[PDB]
């Protein structure tokens, strides 16, 4: 198991523009296109992202390319974030993947806001962090996914994905 497979499980794969859990236009493996309510706007961002006239549809290869880019950007963003980097550096490899999963879903800004949980993770207070992570909009909106990521931080294994 690894960050790629983990996210591929959590995000799924769709070759046509679709709307995410929040109602935003998305494509591939969780690649957010825009928050704009306009499908046209989405179509435009997609073509810009792919480099061609897609007409709202992409191939598997194309989706995978966006995916590789987004994972890289996600991790690199953590390293560039002063509040996240320390946390991430303190963690073991499995747990790093958990943090990166959160960043991928909610943005660096959103995760940096989990101040108290970050502190607990940094202190390796696993059970405590898990409880605090659950007190959030994130957990209430996407509970199954949130549970998977939380268990990963709690146990340090890939069990929830197994």
Please give the annotated binding residues for substrate, written as ranges: 32, 104, 117, 132
**From the candidates 5, 10, 20, 45, which is the catalytic residue?**
20
- Closest Cα partner for 75 from 105, 97, 49, 92? 97
Instruction: Determine which residue in the list 53, 61, 144, 162 makes contact with Cl ion, applying CB under 5 A.
Output: 144
Contact present, 34 and 42 (Cβ < 8 Å) = yes
- How many other CB atoms are found less than 10 A from the CB of residue 70? 18
CB nearer Cl ion, residue 145 or residue 154? 145
3-state DSSP assignment of residue 91? coil
Q: Is 5 a catalytic residue?
A: no
CB nearer Cl ion, residue 27 or residue 94? 27
Instruction: Determine which residue in the list 49, 63, 99, 103 makes contact with Cl ion, applying CB under 5 A.
Output: 49
Contact present, 102 and 75 (Cβ < 8 Å) = no
Breaks (C-N over 2.5 A) in the chain follow: none
Residue 16 main-chain phi, psi, to 5 deg: -120, 145
Site membership for Cl ion, residue 145 (CB under 5 A): yes
CB nearer Cl ion, residue 121 or residue 146? 146
Q: Is 64 a catalytic residue?
A: no
Indicate the annotated binding residues.
32, 104, 117, 132
Active site residues: 11, 20
Where do contacts with Cl ion occur on this chain (CB under 5 A)? 49, 142, 144-145
């Amino acid at each position: 198991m690894n960050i790629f497979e983990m996210l591929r499980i959590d995000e799924g794969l769709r070759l046509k523009i679709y709307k995410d859990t929040e109602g935003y236009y998305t494509i591939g493996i969780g690649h957010l296109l825009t928050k704009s309510p306009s499908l046209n706007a989405a179509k435009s961002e997609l073509d810009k992202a792919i480099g061609r006239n897609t007409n709202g549809v992409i191939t598997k290869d194309e989706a995978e390319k966006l995916f590789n880019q987004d994972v890289d950007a996600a991790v690199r963003g953590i390293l560039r974030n002063a509040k996240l980097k320390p946390v991430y550096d303190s963690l073991d490899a499995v747990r790093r993947a958990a943090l990166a999963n959160m960043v991928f879903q909610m943005g660096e800004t959103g995760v940096a806001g989990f101040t108290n949980s970050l502190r607990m993770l940094q202190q390796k207070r696993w059970d405590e962090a898990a409880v605090n992570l659950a007190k959030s909009r994130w957990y209430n909106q996407t509970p199954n996914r949130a549970k998977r990521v939380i268990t990963t931080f709690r146990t340090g294994t890939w069990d929830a994905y197994k």
